[PDB]
Design a protein around this ligand. Structure first.
Ligand SMILES: Cc1ccc(CS(N)(=O)=O)cc1F
Length: 284
């Protein structure tokens, strides 16, 4: 049996290395990573890899790893795939912990936009979880945390994290993580996967995929929302992605909305994440 070495970037930034038989399906590697992480609520999560364009792709657990990575390195990341709309309802604290680590990267990266006060509040719960009770000894008027909290760090943000951290005395890591999630879950881009596209007139839009449905972000005043029940059918053809929407009270037949993606691969990727999130929705 010939085995391929796999390297997985974990959500704490560390690297897990293991071997799988070269013809292994994704699920084999994923099971090894989740056992390493002591994770039981596995189906919220998945592995990604980067292709030659350095675009992220979900490793399909049902398909051979080699038919997905193809010419690329067997290098993966462990990530949240399905963001729980209600993290309080997860059965295990360790699940909420990994979701916190993913969200911290969502924030620092700018994928999850956040007001100054939300950045500071989330940062304060992370510090409480990571270091425990506020200690003046390792925090002078000039203090700067090791923790990355935001896409752009300022002294004013560091000071506000410390002010809020003082208020959390006696909070355990599980409690601070639950508070972090109660706040993060409310953010307008929580669990939203954004895809670049053009509408049928060639105007640049963003399509967002999430547990509740599909968003068409046209401009700040114009954001079309289609809850999953309103979506009859999804499809891709060449560089085009189509959604069929149930007729409204003033409609006789369904409507079709068409979108132009950059390339055939970007259309197929969008279709697959839509199908997957639609199934997640049907499980809620
Ligand atoms: C798709 C999907 C199914 C089930 C669960 C719950 S679990 N098995 O992780 O505890 C999460 C999911 F995201």
């Amino acid at each position: 049996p010939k085995s391929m070495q796999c390297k997985v970037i974990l959500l704490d930034g560390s690297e897990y290395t293991c071997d799988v038989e070269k013809r292994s399906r994704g699920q084999v590697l994923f099971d090894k990573v989740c056992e390493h992480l002591n994770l039981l609520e596995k189906d919220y999560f998945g592995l990604t890899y980067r292709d030659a364009e350095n675009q992220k792709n979900w490793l399909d657990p049902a398909k051979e790893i080699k038919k997905q990575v193809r010419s690329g390195a067997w290098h993966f990341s462990f990530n949240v795939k399905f963001y729980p709309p209600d993290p309080a309802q997860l059965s295990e604290d360790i699940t909420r912990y990994y979701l916190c680590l993913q969200l911290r990267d969502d924030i620092v990266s700018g994928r999850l936009p956040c007001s100054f006060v939300t950045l500071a509040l989330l940062g304060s719960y992370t510090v409480q979880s990571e270091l425990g009770d506020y200690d003046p000894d390792e925090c002078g008027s000039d203090y700067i945390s090791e923790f990355r909290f935001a896409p752009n760090h300022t002294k004013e943000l560091e000071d506000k994290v410390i002010e809020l951290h003082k208020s959390h005395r006696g909070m355990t890591p599980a409690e601070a993580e639950m508070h972090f999630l109660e706040n993060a879950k409310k953010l307008s881009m929580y669990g939203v996967d954004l895809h670049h596209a053009k509408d049928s007139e060639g105007v640049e839009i963003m399509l967002g995929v999430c547990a509740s449905g599909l968003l068409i972000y046209r401009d700040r005043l114009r954001i079309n929302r289609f809850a999953w029940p309103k979506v009859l059918k999804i499809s891709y053809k060449r560089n085009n992605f189509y959604i069929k929407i149930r007729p409204g009270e003033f409609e006789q037949f369904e409507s079709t909305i068409g979108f132009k993606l950059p390339n055939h691969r970007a259309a197929k990727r969008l279709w697959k994440v839509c199908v997957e999130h639609h199934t997640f929705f049907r499980l809620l």
